[PDB]
Amino acid sequence: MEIVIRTGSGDVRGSKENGIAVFRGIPYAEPPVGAHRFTAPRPPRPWDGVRDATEFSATAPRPPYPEAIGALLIERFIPGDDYLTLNVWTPDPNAVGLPVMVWIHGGAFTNGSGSEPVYDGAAFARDGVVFVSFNYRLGIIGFADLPDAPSNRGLLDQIAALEWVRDNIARFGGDPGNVTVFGESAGAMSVCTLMATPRARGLFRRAILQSGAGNMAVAAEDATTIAAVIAHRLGVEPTAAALAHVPVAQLLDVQQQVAQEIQGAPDPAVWGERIAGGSVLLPFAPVIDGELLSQRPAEAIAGGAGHDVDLLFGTTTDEYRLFLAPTGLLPFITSDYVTAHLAKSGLDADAAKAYTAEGRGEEPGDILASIITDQVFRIPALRIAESRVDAPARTFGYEFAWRTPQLDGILGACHAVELPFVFRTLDRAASLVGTNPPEELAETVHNAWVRFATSGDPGWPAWNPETRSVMRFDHPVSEMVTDPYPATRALWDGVP
Numbered sequence: 001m002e003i004v005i006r007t008g009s010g011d012v013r014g015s016k017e018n019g020i021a022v023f024r025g026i027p028y029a030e031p032p033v034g035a036h037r038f039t040a041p042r043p044p045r046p047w048d049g050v051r052d053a054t055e056f057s058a059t060a061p062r063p064p065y066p067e068a069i070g071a072l073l074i075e076r077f078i079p080g081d082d083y084l085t086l087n088v089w090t091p092d093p094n095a096v097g098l099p100v101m102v103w104i105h106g107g108a109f110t111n112g113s114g115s116e117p118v119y120d121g122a123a124f125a126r127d128g129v130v131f132v133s134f135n136y137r138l139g140i141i142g143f144a145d146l147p148d149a150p151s152n153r154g155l156l157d158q159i160a161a162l163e164w165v166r167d168n169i170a171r172f173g174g175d176p177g178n179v180t181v182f183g184e185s186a187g188a189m190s191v192c193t194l195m196a197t198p199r200a201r202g203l204f205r206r207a208i209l210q211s212g213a214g215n216m217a218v219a220a221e222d223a224t225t226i227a228a229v230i231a232h233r234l235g236v237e238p239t240a241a242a243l244a245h246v247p248v249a250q251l252l253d254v255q256q257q258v259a260q261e262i263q264g265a266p267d268p269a270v271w272g273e274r275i276a277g278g279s280v281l282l283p284f285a286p287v288i289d290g291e292l293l294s295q296r297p298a299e300a301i302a303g304g305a306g307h308d309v310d311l312l313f314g315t316t317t318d319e320y321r322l323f324l325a326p327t328g329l330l331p332f333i334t335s336d337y338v339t340a341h342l343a344k345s346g347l348d349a350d351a352a353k354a355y356t357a358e359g360r361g362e363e364p365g366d367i368l369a370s371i372i373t374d375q376v377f378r379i380p381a382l383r384i385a386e387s388r389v390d391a392p393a394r395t396f397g398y399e400f401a402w403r404t405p406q407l408d409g410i411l412g413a414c415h416a417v418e419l420p421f422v423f424r425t426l427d428r429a430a431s432l433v434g435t436n437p438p439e440e441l442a443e444t445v446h447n448a449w450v451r452f453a454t455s456g457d458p459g460w461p462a463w464n465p466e467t468r469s470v471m472r473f474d475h476p477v478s479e480m481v482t483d484p485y486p487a488t489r490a491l492w493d494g495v496p
Contacts, residue, residue: 106185188212195306
């Protein structure tokens with residue numbers, strides 16, 4: 001049952017699990033402890049002999065998800081400091097040139113891990129694909145901007161993991177020249193960021209963006225404000241020199257309070273006018289630091305970044321209901337709040353009527369969820385696709401429309417719902433998808449992902465601005481649709 005493969009830092013021992021070879025917790029960077037919380041990832045100290053790679057490693061420090069989210073998205077924490085590791089599933093390390101899929105987990109840049117049970121790679125390996133997942137630094141440690149630390153450690157970690165794949169995956173049966181990077185939410189936003197980052201050059205041939213685009217980056221001046229507030233609350237200076245010594249529980253407490261304040265209504269006396277006015281979507285997203293990431297990923301992609309990479313992208317029909325619906329408070333939202341929200345984007349109150357006309361909500365709270373779905377997910381995804389009209393590589397789109405039955409159906413096809421369908425891990429995701437989700441749909445979705453990694457074509461017509469065609473996944477029927485929701489789409493043509 002043991003299987004020993006040579007890496008770059010030494011031999012690792014995995015296990016053969018039913019025609020599949022699995023390796024868990026292969027280190028790709030030295031433990032980021034103390035001052036090394038904030039330094040660039042360092043390749044692991046090489047070793048003689050065989051290091052065990054049969055168990056998942058520690059995961060990155062993270063606070064709990066907010067209570068309502070956390071009941072639906074149940075995380076598995078693994079203790080320890082040696083968390084910059086990756087995991088490989090392959091049908092046979094001696095195979096020749098298999099497609100390689102590298103998963104970047106989501107979690108708002110503060111949560112998640114590569115080793116969550118829902119991200120199990122076995123179904124990909126069974127289908128002839130080498131699958132890799134990994135952990136990267138999160139939150140303050142991963143992304144808070146400090147004058148004495150390289151920016152965006154978590155992005156550097158993702159680059160280091162992808163370099164590990166380039167330099168080692170052939171020994172696991174994979175073609176380094178056929179890597180599809182994929183991710184969901186913050187993982188998909190990370191992929192877009194990597195497309196806009198010169199340091200990530202050549203590390204992937206294809207990309208799958210599940211519910212994330214190029215909008216999620218923190219302006220350098222806002223990151224400086226965020227670090228200053230964090231340091232003030234910790235009673236230390238806003239430097240890596242100071243934060244290297246703060247106990248991690250104290251870091252996570254301040255981090256979680258910052259996350260809560262920015263998600264709500266930030267007090268201008270604490271945060272300044274920009275942040276109080278909503279200039280930060282996620283406060284630990286990658287910083288536009290100027291050297292690693294020179295501009296917001298959306299603008300880089302509009303100028304050609306990633307146009308050589310084949311792209312499959314999509315969103316769920318009801319993305320933002322995950323954040324607004326599960327506590328039963330949607331019915332209290334008022335029309336005047338929706339109108340004020342539309343006004344922040346320069347749209348008139350009657351924009352709400354376009355949502356209702358397209359079946360995207362009759363009550364104000366339902367309309368608000370659809371608006372924010374468009375602002376955060378759907379329109380940013382479409383802007384990337386539109387930018388690629390003349391790209392040499394191919395572009396395909398999907399809409400994941402299957403609705404989860406949890407909480408009497410109130411979530412619809414909410415954010416994250418496609419995850420266990422992609423991975424064929426429905427029995428591990430019942431908190432989000434319920435007890436009896438359709439395995440046929442998991443087969444359909446997962447097989448399309450395998451086809452895309454294999455060939456760059458998921459098996460349906462390419463996306464273009466003429467017909468704007470996407471595969472609408474649902475059960476019992478999945479089928480192509482053209483330019484869904486066109487009137488609500490057109491509302492956003494001139495919005496900043």
